[PDB]
């Protein structure tokens, strides 16, 4: 099974998922001096007021906070997007040390972690059909740096003890994703892919420039999770990030000047 170790990590993914060496793979390094401000971009709209979380799950590579997407409750639109994208789940990527963990990098800078809010284009009916389209998904990426604690994240942190191992899930209702957002919505955008197998190239990436700060204690809690299942040798869930991939024939647009 794919993972982040030496024998099943990112360098091995292309074997089971050839698209790993595709033309629009993510993450990528965001070179701020090559990214161009795009006037055609409309303001970004993040509407999470009616978000309805359902459960939190440890899938062996990260933990997913799932949402009820049977209705337009939590949506993303505007910016580089055409139409409406519904929030289906969010998760993080983090390191074993504060100096690494993010997937996208800014001028080669690696953040301690990165949050990915995954949304699917409503014109496709469901997530399954959406990931069969070039504009099927929109992922809002938010960098995490270690400093002050993030209050809106503590609820996630305190439930991790109940889903320490692969396969474990816990009721995670009434979680407000708005508490994970930074002040500014300035962002960089480019066409990309999911950063975990199957690495589908259906994502319009919207990476926020402003990182959120989380405490050392909070990230340390992330690092207590296990990649392994209950009863198996303990392998700490850390460094579950894919490195920057070739930008190839792509242009990163900045929503700001
Ligand atoms: N390997 C997982 C990858 C995944 C991660 C997160 C959400 C959905 C899927 C799969 O069965 O999907
Ligand atoms: Hg696609
Ligand atoms: Zn991700």
Curated annotation (Swiss-Prot):
Organism: Homo sapiens
Result for mutant: residue 59 to L: Reduced activity
Biological role stated in the UniProt entry: Catalyzes the reversible hydration of carbon dioxide. Can also hydrate cyanamide to urea. Stimulates the chloride-bicarbonate exchange activity of SLC26A6. Essential for bone resorption and osteoclast differentiation. Involved in the regulation of fluid secretion into the anterior chamber of the eye. Contributes to intracellular pH regulation in the duodenal upper villous epithelium during proton-coupled peptide absorption.
A GO term for molecular function: carbonate dehydratase activity
GO BP terms, alphabetized: angiotensin-activated signaling pathway; carbon dioxide transport; morphogenesis of an epithelium; neuron cellular homeostasis; positive regulation of cellular pH reduction; positive regulation of dipeptide transmembrane transport; positive regulation of synaptic transmission, GABAergic; regulation of chloride transport
Domain Alpha-carbonic anhydrase: start-end pairs: 1-256
The protein, known as: Carbonic anhydrase 2
One matching Pfam family: Carb_anhydrase
Mutagenesis or variant effect for residue 118 to A/G/I/L/S: Reduced CO(2) hydrase and p-nitrophenyl acetate esterase activities
Residue(s) at site: Fine-tunes the proton-transfer properties of H-64: 4, 59, 64
Activity regulation as described: Activated by X-ray, histamine, L-adrenaline, L- and D-phenylalanine, L- and D-histidine, L-His-OMe and beta-Ala-His (carnosine).
Mutation effect (residue 103 to A/Q): Strongly reduced CO(2) hydrase activity
Site description Involved in the binding of some activators, including histamine and L-histidine, residues in chain: 89
Cofactor descriptive note: Zinc. Can also use cobalt(II) with lower efficiency, but not copper(II), nickel(II) and manganese(II).
Effect annotated for changing residue 118 to K/R: Strongly reduced CO(2) hydrase and p-nitrophenyl acetate esterase activities
Catalysed reactions, as listed in the record: hydrogencarbonate + H(+) = CO2 + H2O; urea = cyanamide + H2O
Lineage of producing organism: Eukaryota, Metazoa, Chordata, Craniata, Vertebrata
Modification sites for Phosphoserine: 162, 169
Enzyme Commission (EC) number: 4.2.1.1, 4.2.1.69
Mutagenesis / variant outcome for changing residue 89 to P: In OPTB3; in Czechoslovakia
Effect noted on mutating residue 114 to Q: Strongly reduced activity and sulfonamide affinity
């Amino acid at each position: 099974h794919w993972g982040y170790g030496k024998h099943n990590g990112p360098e091995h993914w292309h074997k089971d998922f050839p698209i790993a060496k595709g033309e629009r793979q993510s993450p990528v390094d965001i070179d701020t001096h090559t990214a161009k401000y795009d006037p055609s971009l409309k303001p970004l709209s993040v509407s999470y007021d009616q978000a309805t979380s359902l459960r939190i799950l440890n899938n062996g590579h990260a933990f997913n906070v799932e949402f009820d997407d049977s209705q337009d409750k939590a949506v993303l639109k505007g910016g580089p997007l055409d139409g409406t994208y519904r929030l289906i789940q969010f998760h993080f990527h983090w390191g074993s040390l504060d100096g690494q963990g993010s997937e996208h990098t800014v001028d080669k800078k690696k953040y301690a972690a990165e949050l990915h809010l995954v949304h699917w284009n409503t014109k496709y009916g469901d997530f399954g059909k959406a990931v069969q389209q070039p504009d099927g998904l929109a992922v809002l990426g938010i960098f995490l740096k270690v400093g002050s604690a993030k209050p809106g994240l503590q609820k996630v942190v305190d439930v991790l003890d109940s889903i320490k191992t692969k396969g474990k899930s816990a009721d995670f209702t009434n979680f407000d994703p708005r508490g994970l957002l930074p002040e500014s919505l300035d962002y960089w955008t480019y066409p990309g892919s999911l950063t975990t197998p199957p690495l589908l190239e259906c994502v319009t990436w919207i990476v926020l420039k402003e990182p959120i700060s989380v405490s050392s204690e909070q990230v340390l809690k992330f690092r207590k999770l296990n990649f392994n299942g209950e009863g198996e040798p303990e392998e700490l869930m850390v460094d579950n990030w894919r490195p920057a991939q070739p930008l190839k024939n792509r242009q990163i647009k900045a929503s700001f000047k």
